[PDB]
């Protein structure tokens, strides 16, 4: 979960400095074929794993990109997706990002 | 004989008259005119005769 | 190095790494240049030097 | 104050009356290209 | 007990037709209130009280 | 012998029941019964100049040993999940069947495989209409008297190795039977576009993870919902398709949509990536945007490899996928 | 909504779907889905 | 006329559920790829049947599992007790 409100600059550039797989933005929203989308990415991301680096995949979800669609919600809905595959875990720092 | 149906009448109504749209379709001279009758919480096509 | 690598492969070009900066160049051969694959600078961004 | 591609002093009514929304959003971006380029360095498909 | 008769009378109301007439017949000895009520509640076309 | 009635009252030639009463299998013999039906279509229909034409309009390219020529004996041997997204409008239905019993035998050399499922889409109505009569010759190849259905899976022992296969025969019909839970009465009107959600919606419910190593694309009819590019970007969309998946696209006539096709398989990422992207503000529209192929868009970020083009028929090999 | 049968982003779409492509032809209104208290741990009532 | 033409009738006194019959035959009707034709008052509506004779669209019989009795109208057995009668129903 990413801070700066109704303006998706931060997640943008954290997508670029981190290396993120997704970064889901307040201007675009998050829709649902977009999250199935992304998902078979994740599933397909994982299949083709075996053999490379394990560096880590990451989704970073602006708070104002989703009312219903939220951090947990998208979370809970890879698991679900991803059949045992894999599995997806949360991190919400929260308003500490200041600094 | 007023008011909205019960839940089994509901079912019954339902149902009966879906199969009754079938029996039209699946209907020739030879098949006799049915009446569309439940038995043992089975629809069943009895003859109207 | 992670952007050129993944940047000329998206645009359809062979990326070759060049090991030892000018004197991998000069001595050449597969030895210092290594064809470079999209997977192969993972995770570079937290890679220091 | 701000930076613009150059540091300019942009008076307040310009962008007060149409280069924001005013309303309950406070907040159109810059950042496109750098969108892009973050979904085609990881092999993110849009629509 | 108004309740009651309003019940009724919205149950007779929930029906199709020509040459058809409901009776209610009303418990309430010495007043019409209940059936004046009734009356109003169920827009009936005539009440003897 | 129930088959026969339906092709009669789907107003199609005889020269299909007449073939299924002289259809007969000496499961005894030395011959597999494969190439007894194999044998028996191309004597009964005379497919010999479609099947010479077929290759000599295609640069001589050989269609009886397509995937046999190209592989070793191990790597035709290995793909176990082959799905077969309809037929070729160019080719007669008597030849296409065919082509899939020579498909079907070509997977099945050696005695030393793995079991295999074969997957046959039947499309469009043109062809749908024939699912039985392939249903009962498959059932006569495979000689599923081992232990036939309305709706189901044959199952037998198919080719030289006797290999295990599990054919499925995917149609409007099947699909039908499915919606009114097996009710007599079917006659309601199935629109091709309904058929593609609802093929995906079988391989959702019965939670299917196995993966397509060997895909066999054409030309099918109701081009306009059956399309060969958007079919393939709808099975790269899904994760259907095994990390090295084969992609073989056989046809005889040549259209936009066989050079559309080719440009973005053989494509580069930037090109792939734009590829989509134009369609998209091209083709959707508030009144189509509902659509399975605004959902499915394909994904730029697989990569492709040519490994077989001879005259308009070739074989892909799924070489990457970048992260 | 039940256990018997599967819940996902396609299912829900295509509800959604079903709902709007109804919405645009109504003109007595008033729809209505039926959800088992016990079909998904994720795709709940609420 | 392309498709088949079936009719519906509720006839005799109210019974709850005609409705639901009513909404069940239609909808069944239309999606079998039928037209529906109500034929209002009972058998009276047959016998008399012109403006008598209406289709019922898919959205017609909007709710009906809830309502009862019929909206289509019922009405007694009298006049398709006599053969004239019958006959001018046919």
């Given at each position: 979960?990413?801070?700066?409100?109704?303006?998706?600059?931060?997640?943008?550039?954290?997508?670029?400095?981190?290396?993120?797989?997704?970064s889901?933005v307040?201007?675009?929203?998050?829709?649902?074929?977009?999250?199935?989308?992304?998902?078979?990415?994740?599933?397909?991301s994982?299949?083709?794993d075996?053999?490379?680096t394990?560096?880590?995949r990451?989704?970073?979800?602006?708070?104002?990109?989703?009312?219903?669609?939220?951090?947990?919600?998208?979370s809970?809905?890879?698991d679900?997706?991803?059949?045992?595959?894999?599995?997806?875990?949360?991190?919400?720092?929260?308003?500490?990002?200041?600094? | 004989?007023?008011?909205?149906?019960?839940?089994?009448?509901?079912?019954?109504?339902?149902?009966?008259?879906?199969?009754?749209?079938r029996?039209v379709?699946?209907?020739?001279?030879?098949?006799?005119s049915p009446?569309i009758?439940?038995?043992?919480?089975?629809?069943?096509?009895?003859?109207?005769? | 190095?992670?952007?050129?690598?993944?940047?000329?492969?998206?645009?359809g070009?062979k990326?070759?790494?060049?090991?030892?900066?000018?004197?991998?160049?000069?001595?050449?051969?597969?030895?210092?240049?290594?064809e470079?694959?999209?997977?192969?600078?993972?995770?570079?961004?937290?890679e220091?030097? | 104050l701000?930076?613009?591609?150059?540091?300019?002093?942009?008076?307040?009514?310009?962008?007060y009356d149409?280069e924001?929304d005013?309303?309950?959003?406070?907040?159109?971006?810059?950042w496109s290209?750098?969108r892009?380029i973050?979904?085609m360095?990881?092999g993110?498909?849009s629509l | 007990?108004?309740?009651?008769?309003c019940?009724?009378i919205?149950?007779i109301?929930?029906?199709?037709?020509?040459?058809?007439?409901?009776?209610?017949?009303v418990?309430?000895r010495?007043?019409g209130?209940?059936?004046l009520?009734?009356?109003?509640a169920?827009?009936?076309?005539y009440?003897?009280? | 012998?129930?088959?026969?009635?339906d092709?009669?009252?789907?107003?199609?030639?005889?020269e299909?029941?007449?073939f299924?009463?002289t259809l007969?299998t000496?499961?005894?013999?030395?011959?597999?019964?494969?190439?007894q039906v194999?044998?028996?279509?191309?004597?009964?229909?005379?497919?010999?100049?479609?099947t010479?034409?077929?290759?000599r309009?295609?640069d001589?390219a050989?269609?009886?040993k397509?995937?046999?020529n190209?592989?070793?004996?191990?790597?035709?041997?290995?793909?176990?999940?082959?799905?077969?997204?309809?037929?070729?409008?160019?080719?007669?239905?008597?030849?296409?069947?065919?082509?899939?019993?020579?498909?079907?035998?070509?997977l099945?050399?050696?005695?030393?495989?793995?079991p295999?499922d074969?997957?046959?889409?039947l499309?469009?109505?043109?062809?749908?209409?024939?699912?039985?009569?392939?249903?009962?010759?498959?059932?006569?190849?495979?000689?599923?008297?081992?232990?036939?259905?309305?709706?189901?899976?044959?199952?037998?022992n198919?080719?030289?190795?006797?290999r295990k296969?599990?054919?499925?025969?995917?149609?409007?019909?099947?699909?039908?039977?499915?919606?009114?839970?097996?009710?007599?009465?079917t006659?309601?009107?199935?629109?091709?576009?309904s058929f593609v959600?609802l093929?995906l919606?079988?391989y959702?419910?019965?939670?299917?993870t196995?993966k397509?190593?060997?895909l066999?694309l054409?030309?099918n009819?109701?081009t306009?919902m059956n399309?060969?590019?958007?079919?393939?970007?709808?099975l790269?969309?899904?994760?259907?398709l095994?990390s090295?998946?084969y992609?073989?696209?056989?046809q005889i006539?040549?259209?936009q949509?066989?050079?559309?096709?080719?440009?973005?398989?053989?494509?580069?990422?930037?090109?792939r990536?734009?590829?989509?992207?134009?369609?998209?503000?091209?083709?959707?529209?508030?009144?189509?945007?509902?659509e399975?192929?605004?959902?499915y868009?394909?994904?730029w970020?697989?990569?492709?490899?040519?490994?077989?083009?001879?005259?308009?028929?070739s074989?892909?090999?799924?070489?990457?996928?970048?992260d | 909504?039940?256990?018997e049968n599967?819940i996902?982003?396609?299912?829900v779409?295509?509800?959604?779907?079903?709902?709007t492509?109804?919405?645009?032809?109504?003109?007595?209104?008033?729809?209505?889905?039926?959800?088992?208290?016990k079909a998904?741990?994720?795709?709940?009532?609420? | 006329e392309?498709k088949?033409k079936?009719a519906?009738?509720?006839?005799?006194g109210?019974?709850?559920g005609?409705?639901?019959?009513?909404?069940?035959?239609?909808?069944?009707?239309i999606?079998?790829?039928?037209?529906?034709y109500?034929?209002?008052?009972?058998?009276?509506?047959?016998?008399?049947?012109?403006?008598?004779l209406?289709?019922?669209?898919?959205?017609?019989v909007?709710?009906?599992?809830?309502?009862?009795?019929?909206?289509?109208?019922?009405?007694?057995?009298?006049?398709?007790?006599?053969?004239?009668?019958?006959?001018?129903?046919?």
């Amino acid at each position: 979960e990413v801070q700066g409100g109704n303006s998706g600059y931060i997640a943008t550039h954290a997508q670029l400095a981190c290396g993120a797989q997704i970064s889901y933005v307040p201007e675009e929203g998050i829709s649902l074929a977009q999250l199935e989308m992304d998902i078979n990415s994740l599933k397909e991301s994982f299949a083709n794993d075996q053999g490379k680096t394990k560096s880590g995949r990451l989704i970073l979800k602006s708070e104002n990109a989703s009312k219903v669609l939220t951090t947990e919600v998208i979370s809970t809905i890879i698991d679900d997706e991803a059949s045992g595959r894999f599995d997806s875990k949360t991190a919400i720092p929260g308003h500490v990002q200041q600094g | 004989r007023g008011g909205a149906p019960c839940a089994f009448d509901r079912f019954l109504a339902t149902v009966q008259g879906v199969d009754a749209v079938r029996a039209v379709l699946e209907s020739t001279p030879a098949i006799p005119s049915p009446v569309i009758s439940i038995l043992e919480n089975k629809i069943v096509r009895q003859p109207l005769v | 190095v992670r952007a050129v690598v993944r940047a000329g492969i998206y645009k359809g070009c062979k990326v070759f790494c060049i090991h030892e900066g000018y004197e991998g160049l000069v001595r050449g051969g597969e030895k210092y240049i290594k064809e470079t694959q999209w997977h192969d600078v993972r995770g570079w961004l937290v890679e220091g030097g | 104050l701000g930076i613009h591609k150059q540091l300019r002093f942009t008076p307040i009514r310009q962008l007060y009356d149409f280069e924001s929304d005013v309303p309950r959003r406070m907040r159109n971006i810059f950042w496109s290209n750098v969108r892009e380029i973050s979904d085609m360095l990881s092999g993110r498909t849009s629509l | 007990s108004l309740d009651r008769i309003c019940r009724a009378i919205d149950y007779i109301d929930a029906t199709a037709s020509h040459s058809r007439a409901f009776i209610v017949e009303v418990m309430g000895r010495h007043c019409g209130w209940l059936g004046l009520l009734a009356g109003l509640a169920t827009s009936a076309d005539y009440i003897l009280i | 012998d129930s088959i026969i009635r339906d092709l009669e009252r789907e107003n199609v030639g005889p020269e299909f029941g007449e073939f299924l009463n002289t259809l007969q299998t000496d499961l005894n013999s030395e011959k597999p019964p494969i190439e007894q039906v194999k044998s028996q279509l191309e004597t009964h229909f005379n497919l010999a100049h479609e099947t010479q034409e077929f290759s000599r309009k295609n640069d001589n390219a050989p269609v009886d040993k397509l995937l046999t020529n190209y592989y070793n004996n191990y790597e035709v041997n290995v793909l176990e999940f082959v799905l077969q997204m309809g037929f070729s409008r160019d080719l007669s239905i008597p030849l296409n069947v065919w082509f899939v019993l020579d498909m079907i035998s070509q997977l099945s050399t050696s005695k030393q495989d793995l079991p295999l499922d074969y997957y046959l889409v039947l499309n469009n109505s043109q062809t749908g209409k024939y699912s039985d009569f392939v249903r009962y010759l498959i059932y006569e190849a495979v000689g599923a008297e081992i232990h036939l259905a309305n709706r189901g899976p044959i199952r037998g022992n198919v080719g030289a190795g006797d290999r295990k296969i599990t054919f499925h025969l995917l149609c409007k019909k099947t699909a039908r039977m499915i919606l009114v839970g097996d009710d007599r009465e079917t006659d309601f009107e199935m629109s091709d576009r309904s058929f593609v959600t609802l093929l995906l919606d079988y391989y959702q419910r019965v939670g299917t993870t196995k993966k397509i190593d060997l895909l066999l694309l054409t030309n099918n009819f109701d081009t306009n919902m059956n399309n060969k590019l958007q079919q393939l970007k709808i099975l790269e969309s899904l994760n259907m398709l095994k990390s090295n998946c084969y992609v073989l696209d056989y046809q005889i006539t040549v259209d936009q949509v066989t050079a559309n096709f080719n440009s973005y398989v053989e494509g580069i990422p930037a090109f792939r990536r734009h590829e989509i992207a134009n369609f998209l503000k091209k083709r959707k529209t508030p009144k189509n945007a509902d659509e399975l192929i605004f959902k499915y868009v394909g994904r730029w970020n697989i990569c492709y490899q040519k490994k077989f083009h001879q005259g308009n028929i070739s074989i892909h090999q799924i070489s990457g996928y970048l992260d | 909504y039940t256990p018997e049968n599967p819940i996902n982003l396609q299912t829900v779409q295509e509800d959604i779907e079903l709902l709007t492509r109804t919405y645009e032809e109504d003109d007595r209104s008033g729809k209505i889905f039926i959800h088992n208290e016990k079909a998904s741990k994720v795709y709940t009532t609420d | 006329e392309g498709k088949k033409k079936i009719a519906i009738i509720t006839s005799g006194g109210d019974a709850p559920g005609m409705n639901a019959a009513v909404r069940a035959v239609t909808r069944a009707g239309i999606f079998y790829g039928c037209k529906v034709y109500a034929c209002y008052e009972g058998y009276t509506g047959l016998v008399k049947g012109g403006d008598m004779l209406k289709e019922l669209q898919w959205q017609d019989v909007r709710g009906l599992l809830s309502i009862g009795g019929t909206i289509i109208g019922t009405a007694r057995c009298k006049e398709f007790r006599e053969r004239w009668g019958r006959l001018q129903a046919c």
